[PDB]
Design a protein around this ligand. Structure first.
Ligand SMILES: Nc1ncnc2c1ncn2[C@@H]1O[C@H](COP(=O)(O)OP(=O)(O)O)[C@@H](O)[C@H]1O
Ligand SMILES: Nc1ncnc2c1ncn2[C@@H]1O[C@H](COP(=O)(O)OP(=O)(O)O)[C@@H](O)[C@H]1O
Ligand SMILES: Nc1ncnc2c1ncn2[C@@H]1O[C@H](COP(=O)(O)OP(=O)(O)O)[C@@H](O)[C@H]1O
Ligand SMILES: Nc1ncnc2c1ncn2[C@@H]1O[C@H](COP(=O)(O)OP(=O)(O)O)[C@@H](O)[C@H]1O
Ligand SMILES: [Zn+2]
Ligand SMILES: [Zn+2]
Ligand SMILES: [Zn+2]
Ligand SMILES: [Zn+2]
Ligand SMILES: [Zn+2]
Ligand SMILES: [Zn+2]
Lengths: 879, 899
């Protein structure tokens, strides 16, 4: 019927709830972070919709997925095969481009094979291929009585087509295509797989369809050009728990007279040229002590430090040894394929004057403009009719979702969470399906407010195509434009998990019991600081940052304040804030090997000792890591189990209760507790270790109890419940208090790092630094901490962030969310528009000064919000 | 929007066609065999629906499938995830049952886990398990001042207590202490001397016997947690059948009475005889029992003198401890790890229920748990009608029913869904691989009905297959239900009623192969019926139809006589099959037609006429065996299991087709012979695919796909081999020709011609000589086999047995096939068919209708004789539905004859 009813849902924290979802409409789930949206939307609805379909693809699939673990639900009538558009399902596995992911490149390959005019490299003339039917009608269009000899002698008049057709047949059979008249050169046939770099049937030999080769870089070899060579200045030759190269280094220095303890910056160019590139055949006396202790004198003609790295990387046939040498190397465009990844004769076929590689190299805009100005013939346009419209709609979708700044050539594994999510969303719009249950997860992530009205436009277009959407958003604009809106459980964890209010946005907005509803009408909101932290003389000063789309950018960052880097997606925020600033500061302060982006210099580095990048990357890459392990709480929590009498008499200490060591862990899962099961076309799944039923330890370890709870149940506790459980212990309590303030409090201590969200993982990291003795000289960089947080959750995360600034430290954040931006003291709005047309400072200073900039897109949307919230405070102030 | 539009389809023979299908309705694709229905319905619409969805399940999913070969279509907008209901996606793989495939068995495991009462086999008392909370209030219900000593197993005494009121504190903690010392078990000696005793686990108070906890996997046979140890959840053993070791209990032992020991072993008999004094010239029947036991079961250690002449000729005397003829087979079968030596010994063995698990397939303690007085295995062993009855009569408590409410309804619905489809006769225990094509297909339909999916595009393939005309309205009724659940159905049918009941009806291409591929007429079945251009409408309107014969072949004096057949549900049946006539064995599904026709009749005639090894079904005897020399069973099974086989091969035409190439001018000078052109010999085949032509790609959850070899582009031969030409076409090109274009092309060679003609006469002619057998329809395969027998010198003493030869044919096509079958009867042979298609039944000269209703309410002869004689039997469903068709077409002819 016209609605999908979900009877009795008990996912995680869902309280055996029933809910109605209006079919064929735009539904939007909302509520506090942890209330249980995903549990319903994804773990319950998407899971069933998908399983029920796949299950019916064969008799085998049903048997496999049948014995598997299903979602805890009584029933769910009205289901449709479901499709998810989240960060998990997208790709991140190298050799894959944006063009390949979106499927556009495949249509390009097909395009080139159908109408691509092949040209001769040497001659630049289009090599043709005619049948006898086309040759005869072209020869016949000459003046009469014109003697011609096929090599038999004929004379053209009128009815000679009988011979000419048969004479050219004998000639072609006597001398045997797309060949060049003046040199034989050819390429038999034009098939799509000739333009594929994932097929040796048309891939570049000297790189195997990779495009970029990989050589040594002078920058990575020596991080800071000013380092004492005695204390290891050159990186690759650092004591690897065994000293051979450190001794060779001395042998070269001692011979040429290179001072060991001098900073490399003030060392003559020749002194350094011998060490890096070699003696050039001149023998150097070299004696060294083996790890055993015995000496061995040689007389080698030192190759140098650079050729050494290239030669050691080249010669090994190990996926382990290479990776140790790849840390001091960087990619370079392949000299043969010019970085286009195809054969030389594959690039010989061009369409609108440009070849397959050049079109892939264009940004979505450039290439969209290209296909409008492509001037084809009648024959060409009639063939490519549908192939062309396909490329035009896909480029269009991408442009709609706000990704028009990135090229089709761009590697897949270098895309942001939001970028990937939206590339999948665009790629899906292209499938033009109907009667499907699309379930999206916060599609505005990494998208500016300006470009939000199109996202609402495309979602509704997809909905109007006969589908039903279920989006999980926290944005006002989208919730107001939704047809139906479901708010979930008051509070989060054991507190939420119920349907607080459901109805039209007007109804939910006027519902007193809706936590979200109150924020929509204005009865509850984020307040603007009455006064803002005026900056002082402490400034960072990046100079001449050019990297990607940056236009010789030169900006100044005020320390000891809440800084917010803003600007539309593609403007170069990542580049300036992370690729340039962080890596740069990082190798100076922490001496990390990360090569910074192209920039001139950065001053004011004498104002801080440590820069920390609170990334949105995972906490760990296995179920070993968890909030406890990362924060070291679990490390401290084991001492208490070692204190109990059971552990004393049995002789247990802080090892039997460990998670990694052989002591008391479960041998069947090797400590994991959760075995990963293999899903081929579907994403991987985690099934509990059937030997210890997911308890993490054998039957003899967890017998030790501390307050009626064993080590398993204590690790299974929640953060909120645990700080109540560990009220007395004053060291364990301080670490749990960080996790609570952070924004969690609802997640469990044992919860495997792999399952944690992007935003969740970031806060577990933010919690580790949260409570530390700060010296007032330390910079924190957070990339969109709002990702996955309710408007209310931002208010409590801002209180936490602003606590760091009060101390004196700095907190730089990259946000599009207007509420986090308005709370900030200083902001740096980046590039007008994205891509090539951006990459420059549009407006600096306090939110108000930025707001009154007619050219800033950020300030334009911030002005009605600042004036919206300024009147609300004045409305509360008077009452 | 409100309709699914397909623009420019070119699948196989489709002529770049555009077509509109109404969304959310019962659309029925119809037309001649090979017109292009599957090419559109399955190879185009369904193909796209599945891919587009699966292609979105993950990143890797897109990369794998995207690089492969997508269907030949310009655009197809308005798609929905598609699901196919055909024979290609039904499990034929051992260890799987009807219960597992339908998912009903899983719900039963969930039922038995939740509410299943576990009882002690030894003591037959419901073993219980109580928490401390339940133990305390049970003791507190006793009268006051009643002394009790809580002791824990000699049994150490915890503490004595007097029950008053506020003693719930101690009582609860002493039990807790007792359960901690004796581990989940504690005995309470009430001083009235009634030592009641309970535990935290499910255990018997009188013998220990426990079961721990009830979990679904404790009832599964695909889990060590529940599977039987002595057979590993198979339920069937595999041991030597005494009946197979001796075909008839009265055959001369001198002329090899025992079959396994049939040309060392012959000379060994001589040794066990000489010794025990068993006569050589012997009709086994009259041999004393001990004389036969020594030879079959062994001397039991006693030494027997045995000398024998080797194949070489030299003698070698031994002094062995003879094992016997029966243990010989079991021992020679078990020890070898050869798929060749086993299969030769497996011929003398038959399946037998596992003595450990009574054939139920689970642990003894798994069968300890029972619901309505019956255990899991018993409920599975019932027929669908039985089980459905059991749950109606099943009587439970308030808690049990409230716990199993959602489970019971699902089980109750699936049983009914199976009943709707007509499968109410088969059990839940029945092996999945033993199902027919129609059955498997319908099981998949029923399972699907239960999914309750919406916005799905189901594509059914002739769901009426193997279904009596009576049970057709229920099929039409359930299809529509699935439709009326927000889904669109695309059914490929040839039945009138199903077309008449359809909403939209597309008639595809006039003619088959290159002659078809177009959309002739498309609208309501009223619009298509009134369209002179629709070849289908002409049969629905009644302009064209299959005429009833003027007179029917009266049986002569020759009759086959099946006596006392009792195999599956057959009830001591005795039937007379008339020879030299077209016979139709009719009846509702489950009546026992297969059983009678193939399992009893064919296997019996086969063992007598051709020394076939198959063990016939339980029957008394079969006379009239002197009236025929051979019995050809034109099975609906595949022609080959590899792409190496194809029409050309099976018929043998491809053998001759290489002799022309081997004898060509270019072959002479190149030294090529009838081997370079061999599809299977390294000589000239493509070394990349080893002569397959198509590589098989590995789809994990999806069925496997066939990708053309990228090196020979599917041609099958290398570059040099196909340079040889014959009349401007090489071997790859001739292998790619249609049977119709081929006979036209090989008109000069009459030996090639006469084979190709059979394929044309048979109905084919649209398919290509090189079409992989793995891709042929069940019906197609049958007809390619029929074409083999089709042309041979008939001596008038052979019997043909075809199973539903109509499967996959238009009404117009049945006409031509009937011409072919009746030509066989004309020449003196007999054709027996097992059909539901009334157009075939009415044409028959004699029909043998089977059992009224299916299952155990069947397996008996309801009516025999001519179609009219059976038309007048009220008790025959066949007649009831046939009587009006005879009256309809008999009037149509008089209407035609009068003008
Ligand atoms: N991977 C997981 N394993 C176990 N429990 C989880 C997992 N993810 C979330 N939960 C539980 O579900 C609740 C949060 O549900 P979730 O769907 O994440 O809410 P939201 O969608 O609003 O973030 C938490 O109380 C948490 O304990
Ligand atoms: N790894 C990369 N390779 C090529 N181009 C890149 C890469 N990273 C960023 N860019 C380009 O730089 C510009 C902005 O990138 P980014 O720093 O992510 O901006 P923002 O953070 O504002 O989205 C875009 O034009 C983008 O295509
Ligand atoms: N796998 C295949 N290989 C080659 N030809 C095929 C294949 N499948 C179908 N065809 C051909 O396509 C034509 C019609 O398709 P088909 O689906 O058989 O029609 P219908 O379903 O109406 O019988 C026939 O000539 C048939 O031989
Ligand atoms: N392999 C088998 N094992 C057990 N029972 C069977 C088997 N095959 C058929 N039966 C049973 O025999 C009965 C009818 O036999 P069948 O020959 O299949 O009828 P029909 O051919 O008329 O459909 C049914 O009750 C069916 O369940
Ligand atoms: Zn040239
Ligand atoms: Zn290259
Ligand atoms: Zn384990
Ligand atoms: Zn007992
Ligand atoms: Zn068994
Ligand atoms: Zn090949």
């Amino acid at each position: 019927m016209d609605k999908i009813i979900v009877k009795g849902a008990r996912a995680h924290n869902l309280k055996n709830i029933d809910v109605e979802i209006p079919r064929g409409k735009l539904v939007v789930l909302t509520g506090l972070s942890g209330s249980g949206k995903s549990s319903l939307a994804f773990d319950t609805i998407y899971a069933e919709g998908q399983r029920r379909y796949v299950e019916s693809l064969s008799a085998y699939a049903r048997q496999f997925l049948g014995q598997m673990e299903k979602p805890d639900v009584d029933a769910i009538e009205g289901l449709s095969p479901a499709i998810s558009i989240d960060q998990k399902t997208t790709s991140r596995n190298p050799r894959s481009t944006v063009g390949t992911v979106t499927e556009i490149y495949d249509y390009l390959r097909l395009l080139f094979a159908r109408i691509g005019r092949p040209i001769c490299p040497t001659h630049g003339i289009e090599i043709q291929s005619q049948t006898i039917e086309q040759m005869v009608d072209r020869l016949l269009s000459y003046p009469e009585r014109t003697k011609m000899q096929i090599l038999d002698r004929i004379i053209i008049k009128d009815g000679i087509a009988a011979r000419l057709a048969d004479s050219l047949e004998t000639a072609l059979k006597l001398a045997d295509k797309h060949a060049c008249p003046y040199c034989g050169f050819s390429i038999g046939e034009l098939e799509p797989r000739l333009f594929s770099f994932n097929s040796p049937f048309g891939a570049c030999p000297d790189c195997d369809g990779l495009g970029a080769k990989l050589e040594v870089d002078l920058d990575l070899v020596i991080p800071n050009d000013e380092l004492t060579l005695k204390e290891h200045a050159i990186a690759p030759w650092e004591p690897q728990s065994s000293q051979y190269y450190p001794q060779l280094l001395e042998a070269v220095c001692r011979h040429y007279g290179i001072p060991m303890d001098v900073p490399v910056k003030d060392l003559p160019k020749e002194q350094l040229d011998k060490i890096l590139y070699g003696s050039g055949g001149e023998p150097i006396y070299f004696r060294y002590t083996n790890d055993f202790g015995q000496v061995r004198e040689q007389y080698i003609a030192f190759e140098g430090v650079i050729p050494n790295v290239e030669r050691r990387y080249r010669e090994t046939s190990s996926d382990y040894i290479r990776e140790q040498m790849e840390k001091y190397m960087a990619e370079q465009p392949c000299p043969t394929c010019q970085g286009y990844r195809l054969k030389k004769e594959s690039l010989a076929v061009l369409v609108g004057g440009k070849h397959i590689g050049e079109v892939t190299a264009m940004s979505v805009t450039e290439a969209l403009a290209f296909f409008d100005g492509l001037e084809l013939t009648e024959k060409e346009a009639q063939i490519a009719r549908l192939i062309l419209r396909e490329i035009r709609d896909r480029l269009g979708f991408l442009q709609n979702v706000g990704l028009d700044y990135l090229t089709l050539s761009r590697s897949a594994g270098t895309l942001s969470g939001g970028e990937a999510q939206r590339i999948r969303l665009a790629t899906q719009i292209g499938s033009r399906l109907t009667g499907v249950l699309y379930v999206l997860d916060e599609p505005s992530i990494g998208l500016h407010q300006r470009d939000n009205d199109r996202l609402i436009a495309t979602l509704k277009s997809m909905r109007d195509l006969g589908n039903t959407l279920i989006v999980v958003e926290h944005d006002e604009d989208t919730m107001l434009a939704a047809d139906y809106l479901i708010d979930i459980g008051p509070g989060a964890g054991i507190h939420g998990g119920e349907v607080v209010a459901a109805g039209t946005p007007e109804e939910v907005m006027n519902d007193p019991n809706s936590l979200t509803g109150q924020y929509l009408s204005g009865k509850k909101f984020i307040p603007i600081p009455a006064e803002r932290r005026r900056p002082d003389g402490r400034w960072l000063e990046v100079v001449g940052a050019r990297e990607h789309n940056l236009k010789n950018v030169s900006v100044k960052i005020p320390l000891g304040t809440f800084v917010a880097v803003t600007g539309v997606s593609g403007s170069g925020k990542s580049t300036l804030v992370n690729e340039v600033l962080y890596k740069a500061l990082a190798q100076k302060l922490h001496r990390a090997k990360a090569k910074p982006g192209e920039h001139r210099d950065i001053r004011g580095l004498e104002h801080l000792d440590k820069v920390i990048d609170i990334d949105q990357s995972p906490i760990g890459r296995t179920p070993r890591s968890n909030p406890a392990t990362y924060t070291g709480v679990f490390d401290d929590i084991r001492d208490v189990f070692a204190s109990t009498n059971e552990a004393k008499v049995r002789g247990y200490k802080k090892g039997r209760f460990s998670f990694n060591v052989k002591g008391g862990r479960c041998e069947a899962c090797h400590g994991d507790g959760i075995i990963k099961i293999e899903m081929h076309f579907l994403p991987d799944v985690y099934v509990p270790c059937e030997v210890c039923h997911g308890k993490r330890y054998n039957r003899e370890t967890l017998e030790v109890t501390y307050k009626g709870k064993n080590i398993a149940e204590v690790l299974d506790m929640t953060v909120e419940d645990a700080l109540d459980f560990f009220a007395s212990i004053p060291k364990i309590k301080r670490k749990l208090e960080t996790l609570y303030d952070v924004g969690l409090g609802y997640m469990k201590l044992g919860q495997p790092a792999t399952t944690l969200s992007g935003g969740e993982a970031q806060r577990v990291k933010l919690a580790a630094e949260l409570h530390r003795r700060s010296n007032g000289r330390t910079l924190y960089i957070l990339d969109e901490p709002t990702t996955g947080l309710h408007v209310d959750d931002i208010a409590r995360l801002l209180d936490v962030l602003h606590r760091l600034v009060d101390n004196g430290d700095t907190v730089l954040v990259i946000e599009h969310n207007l509420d986090v931006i308005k709370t900030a003291d200083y902001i740096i709005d980046l590039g007008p528009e994205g891509g090539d047309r951006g990459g420059q400072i549009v407006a600096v200073g306090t939110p108000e000064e930025v707001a009154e900039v007619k050219e800033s897109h950020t300030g334009r949307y911030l002005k009605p919000i600042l004036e919206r919230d300024r009147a609300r405070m004045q409305a509360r102030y008077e009452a």
